[model samples]
Target: RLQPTLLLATLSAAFGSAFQYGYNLSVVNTPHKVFKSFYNETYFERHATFMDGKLMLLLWSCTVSMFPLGGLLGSLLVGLLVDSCGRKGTLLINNIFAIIPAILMGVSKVAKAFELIVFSRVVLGVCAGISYSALPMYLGELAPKNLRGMVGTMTEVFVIVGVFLAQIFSLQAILGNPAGWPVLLALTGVPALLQLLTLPFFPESPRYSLIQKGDEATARQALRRLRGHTDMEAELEDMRAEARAERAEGHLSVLHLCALRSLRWQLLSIIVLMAGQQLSGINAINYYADTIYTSAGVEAAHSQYVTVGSGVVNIVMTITSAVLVERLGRRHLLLAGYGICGSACLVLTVVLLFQNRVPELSYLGIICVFAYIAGHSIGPSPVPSVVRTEIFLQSSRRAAFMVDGAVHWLTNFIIGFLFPSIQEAIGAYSFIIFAGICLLTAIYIYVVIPETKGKTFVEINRIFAKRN
Candidate 1:
C-alpha cells in the first residue's frame, strides 16, 4: 500500500511552504487601492504634503519588485541552509519570514509604515524562495522512486492552488475591501501557522539522513514510518551506494560545477529548461490576456473574471498534468506542452494579425490563448522544476537546485526587465518568437534528455552517462 502518511506529510508541508509562495504574490496584488491610499496618507503625515504621484509609483513598484530580488537572495542561500539545517528544519525555520510579515501587513494602517509592507514583500519572498527549493528536494527524497514524479508534480499543483485561493480571497466578500485588505495581506500567516503546526509531526527526509548524514539507523525508521513497513532493505541499499558514490565524488562549488564536464549537460539542461520556462511568453499571456480578450470581442471590462478564468484553466490542467506525468512520462508531457504551445502560439500570431478585420478569427485567438495556458500548465511550467530535481544525484543535487532556482528567479528578473519592452515592440509578431522558443527548446530536449521514469538515482544518471 502507498501509505497515506506520505500524503499527510506532503499536505502539511505544501500548505505552509509551496502554498505560501503563490498566495503571497497574488494576495498582495488585489488590495492595491488600500495599499496605495495608506502609503500616500502616511507620506502626507510625515512630509506635511501629499506624496508625489511618481514617488507613490516608485514605492509601489519597490513593494512588488522586491519579491524576486529576495527570491534571488533565497536561491543563493539554498546550498548553505539545506546542507546545514536539513530540509525539514530549514522549512520550519522559514516560517519566521511569513509570520512577522503577516503581522506587519495587518498593522500597516496603524503603524503608518507602508515601508513595512514593502519590506514584508521581500522577506515573505525570501521565505518562499527558500521553501521553493527545499520543499521539493525534501519531497523527492521521501518519495518512493515509482512515486517521485507525482510528488514533484504536486508541488506545482499546490502552488497554483495557492494562486487560485489568493485570487478567490481577493474578492470583496472576503478580503478585497479597504477594511479587510490588511487581513488579506496578513492571511498567509495562517497557512504558515498551519505548516508550523502540522509539519512537526511529519518525518524528516529519509534519504537525506542516510546519504547526507550516513545515519543508517535514522534513515531506516524514517523510511519505514513513511512507507508503513520496515522492509526497507532494498531502499536502504540504494541510499548506501548513493552515499558512497557522493563521498568519493564530493560536493562541487559553483566554479567547480562549471568546470565539471561530466555534469555540464545536466547543468545546461537545467538552465535551458528553467530559462525557457520564463522566456517562453506565459508572462506575456498573463499580463496581456485581458487586452487579447477585448480584441476577441469578449466583455473586456470584466477582465478580472478573464484573469480568474485562465487561473481556473491553469489549476485544472496542472492537476491533469500531475496525474498524467506518472502514466505518460515527463518527456511526453514536456513534448506535449511545448508542441501544443508552439502550434498554439503560431495560431495565436495569425489570429492576432487577422482579428481586427475578421471577427471570427478574434474568437479563435482566445481559445488559442487558453490552449497555450493549458499546454504550459501540463508541461513547461511544472516539469522543468521536477526535471531539475530528478536529474541530479545527492552530491550535486543541492548545487543543481541552487542553479535551478537561481535560473528560475534570475530569468524571472530578466523577464521583468525585458518582457514588457520586448512584447511591446514586437506587437502581434511576438508570439512568433515564443513559438520558436517553444519548438526549438522542445527539439533540443527530445534530442538530449532520456526518459527518467521509474529509475533510481544511479540508474537515471547512467542514462546520461555517455556524455558524462
Candidate 2:
C-alpha cells in the first residue's frame, strides 16, 4: 500500500512532463489537415493551384522544423538552468511558455490566419523542446536506481495517452463547423497548466542535489519520497563521492565537452544513441499516421479512429518497455526492437506493392505500423533519454545531456520537416525508406550500444570505459 502511494506521488510529477510531451505532440496531428483546408479555403480563396503539392509540403516541413529549432536552443538553456534553478523549477517554467501559444493556436481558428497558427505552433514547439530534454533527466535523477527504468519508461506511457486524448477530441470535434477545431486545440493546454501549478510541491531530483550541490539532507528527503522505507544516507554519500571524483577529472563544462580528447567515446556514444533513436522515423510514423492511413484508402474521419488505435497500441507496448528494460537489458531490447520494427516495415512495403492496397491489407499496414511503434516503445523511445545521461559522469552530465538533447531535437526537426516532402515523392513506398534505416540502426545497436542493465552508475561507466 505504501509502495503504491510513494510510486504514484513520484510518477505524478514525472507524468506532468510527459503530459506536456504528449499534448504538444498529439494536438498538432489532426489539426494540420484542418489548417491545410483553412489555407485552401480562406488564404488562397479556395484556389486550385498545381503548386498545392509543393506548398503543402513546405508548410508541413516548416511546422515540423520549428519545434526542433526551439528544442535545440531549449536543450542548451535547460542544461544550464536545470542544474542551477533545479529540475522541478525548470519543468514548471516551460508550462507557462507552452500554454500561451496553445491558446493562440485555438484563437487562430476564428481569425483564419494561417501565419498566426504556424507561429503559435512554433512557440509551443520551443516550450516542448525544453520539456522534452528536461523531463527525462529530471525523472531519472529523482528515481531510485533500482526503479529508474520503470520511472523513465513512464514518459512514453503519458505521451501515448496525450496523443490518444488529442485524436479522440479532434475526431469528435469535427462537427460540421470547423470553428470548434480551435477549441480542441486550445484544450491541450489544460493538463499542462495543471502540471505547472502542481510540480513545485513535488520533490527535486535527489541525484542532482546530492551530486551537484552536496545537499545530503534534501537528497535524502527526495529519496524517501521515491523509495518509501528505503534508507538513503549511504547512497547520498556515494553520490557526493562520485561528484567529487567527476570534478577532479575537469570534464564538466561545455568547453570540456568540446575540448576533451579522452572523452571522445563518451560524447560519440551519446550523440549516436540520440541520433539513432530519432533516425528510426518513429515521429514520421506518428506525425503522418492519419495521412499515411488515408492514402491507403481509409477515410479521414475513420483514420482518426485508426489514429487512436495506433496511440493505444503505442501505450500498450510501452508498458512492456518499463517491465522489460530493467530485466532484459537495454542492449538486448534495442537490438530486438530494430529487428522487429525493420521486419514490420519490410512486410508493410511488400504488402503495399503486391496487395494493391486492399482494405484488409491496409489493415495489415496498420498492424505493421503498430508493430513498429511497439518496437520503439520497447527500445528507442524511452532508453536514449536515460542512457545518454547514464553514459557520462555526474560532472559532465549537463553539457553531455545538452548534446544528446540537441541531437534528439535536430533529428526530430529532420524527420518532422522532411517527412511530408518525402511522402509526396515516394507515395506508398515511404515505409520502404524507413525499413532500410531501421535495418542500419539494428546493425549499429548490435555493434555498439551497450548493455547497462543491473549495473551501478560506476559500473556502467566502467563498462563503456573498457570498450574504449
Candidate 3:
C-alpha cells in the first residue's frame, strides 16, 4: 500500500540524512585509539613537544565532545532554518555541512591537521543536529494518519541501520583501521551527496506548504503526490483546521511557548520524554560498548563483533517497534520498553558485579547488553521524537524542535562527558542509576503520556486538553 513517492521521500531524505547522523555517532568509537595516536602525533609535530597523556586525553575528549556542542548550536538554528528555509530546503542546505566536513576528515592525516578532524566533527554534528530536528517533523507531516507511526519511526529505523552498518564497516577487516579510518569517517558524506541528488524530486511537506505558507494549491499537489491520489480532501481538511488553530495561537517564541497554558501539558510531556530518553543511559551503553564487552571478559579483538551483535539486536528490535507502534500504541510500547530496560539494567548490574568471580556467567553480561539494547530500540529511542511531532501544531513545532534538540543534545553532552568519571567512581553499579531513572520514567509516562496511535493532531491536542 506504500506509494513510490513515499518510498523515494523516505529513502532519499529520511534514510540518507538519518543514516549519516547515526553512522557519525558510532564510527568514531571504533577508531578511538587510532585517532588518539593521530592526536598525539599531530600535537608533537606542530608544537615541537610531547603532549602529556592527561592533556592529550583532555584534548581528545574535547575533540569528541565538540560534536554534541555543535549539535546544541545547530538545534538553536533549527527554528530559524525551519521558518526561513522550510523543512525540505533546510535539509537540502544542511548537506553542505556534512559534505564539507567529510572532505576535511577524509584528508586530515594527509594535511597533518588533526585539528581539522575535530572541526569536521563539529560541523558533522551540526548536520546531524539539523537532520534529527527536521527529519522527524518532515516525516510526520508527510505521512498519512493511518501510517504515521510506522513512517515516523522510520527515522529511528534508519538510525539503527546506520549504527549497524557503521559497526560492520568499522571492523578492522573493513574501515576501522588507520589506513581505512578516513574512508570510514568520510563515508558520512555519501548519504548527504545522495540526498542532495535525489530529494529535490520529492515534494515538500504538505502541511508546511499549506499551514506555514498558506499555499493551498501547492499543498494539494504535495498531498496528492504523497498520498498517490487526487482525493486528499480528508487530509486537507485536517490540515486546514490545524492551520486555523495555528493562526489563532499566532507564532509563539520559545519563552512564550513555555507560558502558554493550553500547551503546558504538551510541552511538559515532550520535555519529560526527551529528557528521559537521553538519561536512560543508551548513550553510555553505546559509548562504552567495547569496554562493556571487554569488562565481561570478552577478548579485545572479539569485543567489536560483540558490539556489532548489539547493533544487530538494536536494528531488529527497532524495526519490530516500527511495525508494532501503530498496533501496540505509543503508551503501551513505552511502558513495556521501560519496564524491560529497567529490569535488564538491574540484571546487568548484578552480572557485572560478579563477572570476575563467576567467569562462567560472563556470557550473561552479553545477554544483558542485548536485552537492554532491545528494550531501548523498542520505545525510548523513537517515541519522544514521534510524540513531539504529533502533539505540537505547525506554529509551535519548529520552536518545539529547537527545545527538543537542545535538551536532547545537552543531556547527550552531559552524559558523554561525565559518565566515564561516574563509571570510574562506581564501576559496575553505574547502571543502577540508569535502572532507577528507567523505573521513574516508566511511572512518569504511565501518568502523563496519552495514547496517540492512529490519532490526528487535533484529537491529540483534545486529549491533552481533557488531561488538563
Candidate 4:
C-alpha cells in the first residue's frame, strides 16, 4: 500500500514538521547554562545592576515555559487554519513561524537580546502546536485505511527521533557549547526548508477534496495516487457517506462537538488520555533528566551522558511500540505501558526516600527513571494520537484536535512551570502524584478506550457506540 507519494508526504510532514517540535524541546535544555550566562551578561550590561539569581531563574523559567504557552495559543488556532487554508495549505504557511523563530534564536546571542530567544520559543511552540493538531489529521486522511495506524505512528516516531538527534547535537562535543549554540538553535530552519520544498508536491488529502470541497474527481485522483489503485469505489462510497453526514450536521464548533451526546465518549476519552500522557511525569523527567540523575547520586559530569542514554531508551521503546501497536492493539499497549510507568514511579518514590540511608539504592532510583521513560514510550506516548485519529470523523476532526491539543499543552505548561516549585515543596515524593495519575489512567484505558486494531472507521464508531 505504500507508494512514492505517500512516502514523500510522510517524510516531509512527519520528519520535516513534526521532528522540529521534538528537536526544540530538548535542544534548549542542553545549552541551559550557556543561555543563562548570556541572559545574565546581557541583563547586567543593559541594566548596570546584576539581576539576582532568583530573578534570573524566574526569567529563565519563563523562557522555558513560553514554548508550551505558545503551544496553547497555537492549539487554539488549528481549527481556523485547517478550515480556512486547508490542512496542506496551513502546514505550508506555518513555516513562517518556524523560520522567523529560527533566525531570532540563532542571532539572539550575537544580537545580545535575550528576549529574542524567549520570543522565538513562543513562535516555535506555535509551530509545534499546529503540527501536533494538524499533522495527525492530515496523515489520517492521506493514508490508506489498512495503513492508517502505521502512518499515524509516524508522527510520534519522527518526534522521538528528533528528540534523540537534538540530544546528540546539543552535546558539548557537538553544538551545545556557547559558540555552537547559535548554530544548534538555527538548525530548526533546515526542517522548515525541507517541508516547504517537498510537501507542496504531495497531494492534498483525498477526504478533504471529496468531503470538504465535494469534488469527487480530485478526490479520486488523490486516492489513486495514495493507494496506487483506481478501483477504490468502496473507499469512495465510505467517504461519500461521511460527506453526506457532514453536510447534514454542518461544521461542528468545538463547543458543539463537546456538547453532542454521540461524540461524548470519543471526546472525553481523547481528552483524558492526552491529559494522562503529560501528567504521567514524562516531560518532567525529560526536561530535568540531568537533575533527576544528579539527585540520584550520579556525578554531575556523568548525568548528561545518562540523560542521553535515557533518550536512547526512549527512542528504542517508541520504535518498539510502532512495530507492535498494530499487532497487539492500542488497549493492550496502553494498559501495559501505564502499568509499568505507574509501578516504576512507585518504586522511584521509595528509592528516593531511602537513597540517603541506603547509598547503594541511588543507582536503582536512576534505573527507575529510565524504566519510566521506557514505559511511557511504548503506549501512553503514542497511543492517544493514533486513537484520536481513528475515532474522530472529518467534520469534527479539527475541532477534536483543538480540544485535545489544548488539554495537552495546558497540562504540559502546568507541569513545566510548576514542577520545580512542586518538587521543592514535596521533595522526592513528587512522583507519587504521577504514580496515582498513571494508575487511574490505566484503569480508564482498560474500561473505556476501545481496541482499534485493524478495524475500519465505521467499525471503530460502532465499538464506541455499543459501549455508549
Best-fitting candidate, scored by TM-score: 1
Error of 1 at 42 (Å): 1.8
Candidate 4's residue-wise lDDT over 135-164, tens digit each?
888888888777787788888988999989
Clash number for each model: 0, 0, 0, 0
Where model 1 places Cα greater than 4 Å from the true spot, the runs are none
Clashing pairs in 1: none
The parts of candidate 3 lying over 4 Å away from their true place are 47-49, 283-297
Q: Work out the TM-score per prediction.
A: 0.97, 0.86, 0.95, 0.94
Displacement of residue 460 (Cα, Å) in model 4 is 1.7
Model 1 Cα lDDT, one tens digit per residue, 180-255: 8887888889999988899989899998888888788988788888977747889989999878776776665676
All candidates' lDDT scores?
A: 0.84, 0.71, 0.84, 0.84
- By summed lDDT, which 10 consecutive residues of candidate 3 come out lowest? 283-292
lDDT of 3 at 245: 76
- Cα lDDT tens digits, model 3, 1-468, are 189898779778776788877888878766788888877788889999987889877877888788888888988887789878788998998899989999999888889988788888889888889989989988998898889988899999998888888888877788767677888888888888988999999999898889889899998888888899657888899999988877776655787875778888887788888888888978556655666688777788787677777778888999899899888899999999999889989988887778778887657777777888899889898877788899888878888888888998998888877787898898877889999999999999999888988888988888898997
Candidate 2 to native Cα RMSD, angstroms = 3.9
RMSD of each: 1.5, 3.9, 1.9, 2.1
Please write out the lDDT profile of model 2 over residues 52-108, one tens digit for every residue. Answer: 678877887677556657667877777767777777778878787778877787777
